[PDB]
Ligand binder design. Structure first.
Ligand SMILES: *[C@@H]1O[C@H](CO)[C@@H](O)[C@H](O)[C@H]1O
Ligand SMILES: *[C@@H]1O[C@@H](C)[C@@H](O)[C@@H](O)[C@@H]1O
Ligand SMILES: [Ca+2]
Ligand SMILES: [Ca+2]
Ligand SMILES: [Ca+2]
Ligand SMILES: [Ca+2]
Ligand SMILES: [Cl-]
Ligand SMILES: [Cl-]
Ligand SMILES: [Cl-]
Ligand SMILES: [Cl-]
Ligand SMILES: [Mg+2]
Ligand SMILES: [Mg+2]
Ligand SMILES: [Mg+2]
Ligand SMILES: [Rb+]
Ligand SMILES: [Rb+]
Ligand SMILES: [Rb+]
Ligand SMILES: [Rb+]
Ligand SMILES: [Rb+]
Ligand SMILES: [Rb+]
Lengths: 254, 140, 198
């Protein structure tokens, strides 16, 4: 996160840290005691599928405390439509092997109904994005969880306010822009998979997943987020599915 | 009536008690700008005469136009929109705290995420579990 | 669908209506409005009108800068087509309505001219605020007046809704008034009131 603040411990209690072979990989969002949403692109380079861990209740990556809870990742489910190395359909649904225990420091973010999310949450201007990613484009990552308030744009506005870059990715219906085009504030590579969370009448909901961007906080560009509202029925059906023997599952979408 | 035309010019007699033409008014005021200033309003017409403000609204006349002032339950240029008839889910979520469902022919209803139940007020939601989704307990 | 165009703010005394083109054919509109940092509020849901009264949203804070946008939806019903409006700041841009001379009285060798309080759409406690309630010292009234038997005009200006002017004995004077916000560079004055004469 560039130009954000430290999220005070416990105040982002749905943020997940994902680890592969014990090393920081990406963020994620807890949505109930068993299931975590993250970004598909976080898994493009994985060879060791049996060594993924989700950490809940994490705050300072330099010190362990009694609020952290680790769980093995049993399944990673990504839309079959997603193409590694690209931006569209950038979502992954992760099944933990054992549930986390909800505590003051560990709480899921609500996955909203689609229509509520399209007709109401989409017009809440500001939402929060978080993670332990880079503090400056191509800079060092953060040791304390960082959080940033970003305003959302309709795609027509984002296109109209964005500097043209030859051969850049299309912003599709499965994405939305959020942030600032003045170089001050954005999410960053190592925030990938982390929540864009929206507060509405006293409850917080998952609306976006940190996904891609032209650098970080680059002038003339916004952050791009996976549009979670397009995946509600896909996630809800998969959360009712039977576990399978291998970790990765590429499931049909829609 | 020629017998009513025997006196010197008079704004009151010619333009107030009667309708007057631009030149009758000019002969009274003489100066071009004074005459124009009078005439622009005098010949304008009361645009509130057609009573365009609905639902008990109040009309104020302007030059070639009017303004309606509505009672609190109404809006629109002519107070034509009933605020009471706008209880639908695209209008600030139907006033529902969490989920909103439209029902044509009848009133919308409000609903809640898992972990919450609807209060008796029909809009507000309350947790039914210790750690419902989307609340930050550390702050409380 | 086709996107709206020529979005235009029509506003007088804070009664504020957004207008646009075209007449809809097999499409309907919905409008949203926000301040720069606030949430979008929807209005005029699925209207076939090419106008939307936004008075009730803008009077909440007349000094905010609002942006509106008009969505087009096809008949029978990702993101719809839309067009943004100009920005609008009501305090700075609303037209001043045509005033009315309420009375004139000769007291002494002078005449008092009273301008009717101009009513606006901003509410407080069940009543509508006057232009002076809203603008205070930012608002003056100006009086254009003349003696019938002389050439030349006279102007007076007031910080309240009353003028007290000197007049020559046994003559008729006529009067007309304007509302003026002197601090403005553009849209500074109302249209002139109807002329009233002794
Ligand atoms: C008289 O009322 C009509 C509508 O009833 C309106 O269109 C005119 O502007 C008004 O003078
Ligand atoms: C004009 O103002 C409106 C709001 C109503 O109060 C009417 O009774 C009045 O004539
Ligand atoms: Ca730690
Ligand atoms: Ca007569
Ligand atoms: Ca004549
Ligand atoms: Ca008129
Ligand atoms: Cl690996
Ligand atoms: Cl485990
Ligand atoms: Cl959406
Ligand atoms: Cl006034
Ligand atoms: Mg008479
Ligand atoms: Mg005559
Ligand atoms: Mg003549
Ligand atoms: Rb592109
Ligand atoms: Rb940058
Ligand atoms: Rb006449
Ligand atoms: Rb006459
Ligand atoms: Rb005459
Ligand atoms: Rb429920």
């Amino acid at each position: 996160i560039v130009g954000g603040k430290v999220c005070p411990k416990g105040e982002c209690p749905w943020q997940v840290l994902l680890l592969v072979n014990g090393a920081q990989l990406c963020g994620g969002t807890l949505i109930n005691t068993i299931w975590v949403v993250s970004a598909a692109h976080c898994f493009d380079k994985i060879k060791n599928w049996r060594n993924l861990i989700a950490v809940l209740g994490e705050h300072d990556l330099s010190e362990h405390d009694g609020d952290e809870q680790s769980r093995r990742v049993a399944q990673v489910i990504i839309p079959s439509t997603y193409v590694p190395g690209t931006t569209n359909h950038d979502i992954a649904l992760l099944r933990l092997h054992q549930p986390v225990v909800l505590t003051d420091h560990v709480v899921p973010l609500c996955l909203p109904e689609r229509t509520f999310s399209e007709r109401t949450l989409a017009f809440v201007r500001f939402s929060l994005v978080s993670g332990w990613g880079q503090l400056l484009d191509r800079g060092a990552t953060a040791l304390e969880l960082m959080v940033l308030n970003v305003p959302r744009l309709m795609t027509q506005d984002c296109l109209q306010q964005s500097r043209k870059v030859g051969d850049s990715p299309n912003i599709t219906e499965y994405m939305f822009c959020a942030g600032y085009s003045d170089g001050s504030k954005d999410s960053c590579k190592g925030d990938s998979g982390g929540p864009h969370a929206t507060h509405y009448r006293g409850t917080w909901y998952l609306t976006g997943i940190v996904s891609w961007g032209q650098g970080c906080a680059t002038v003339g560009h916004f952050g791009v987020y996976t549009r979670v509202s397009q995946y509600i029925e896909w996630l809800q059906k998969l959360m009712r599915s039977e576990p399978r023997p291998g970790v990765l599952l590429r499931a049909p979408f829609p | 009536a020629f017998l009513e035309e025997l006196r010197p010019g008079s704004l009151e007699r010619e333009c107030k008690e009667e309708q007057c033409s631009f030149e009758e008014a000019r002969e009274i005021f003489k100066d071009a700008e004074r005459t124009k200033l009078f005439w622009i309003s005098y010949s304008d017409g009361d645009q509130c005469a057609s009573s365009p403000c609905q639902n008990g609204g109040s009309c104020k006349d302007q030059l070639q136009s009017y303004i309606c002032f509505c009672l609190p339950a109404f809006e629109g240029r002519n107070c034509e929109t009933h605020k009471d008839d706008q209880l639908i889910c695209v209008n600030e979520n139907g006033g529902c705290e969490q989920y909103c469902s439209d029902h044509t022919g009848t009133k919308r209803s409000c609903r809640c995420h898992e972990g919450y139940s609807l209060l008796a007020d029909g809009v507000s939601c309350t947790p039914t579990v210790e750690y419902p989704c989307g609340k930050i307990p550390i702050l409380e | 669908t086709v996107a709206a165009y020529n979005l235009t703010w029509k506003s007088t005394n804070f009664k504020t209506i957004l207008e646009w083109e075209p007449k809809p054919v097999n499409q309907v509109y919905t409008v949203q409005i926000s301040t720069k940092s606030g949430d979008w509020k929807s209005k005029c849901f699925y209207t076939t009108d090419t106008e939307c009264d936004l008075t009730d949203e803008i009077v909440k804070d007349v000094k905010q800068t609002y942006l509106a946008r008009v969505f087009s939806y096809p008949a029978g019903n990702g993101e719809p087509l839309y067009e943004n409006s100009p920005e609008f700041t009501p305090y700075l841009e609303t037209n001043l309505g045509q005033p009315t001379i309420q009375s004139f009285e000769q007291v002494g060798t002078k005449v008092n001219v009273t301008v009717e309080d101009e009513r606006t759409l901003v509410r407080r406690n069940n009543t509508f605020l006057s232009l002076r309630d809203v603008f205070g010292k930012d608002l003056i009234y100006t009086l254009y007046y003349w003696k019938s038997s002389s050439s030349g005009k006279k102007t007076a200006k007031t910080n309240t809704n009353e003028f007290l002017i000197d007049v020559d004995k046994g003559e008729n004077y006529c009067f007309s008034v304007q509302a003026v916000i002197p601090s403005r560079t553009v849209n500074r004055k109302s249209t002139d009131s109807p002329v009233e004469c002794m």
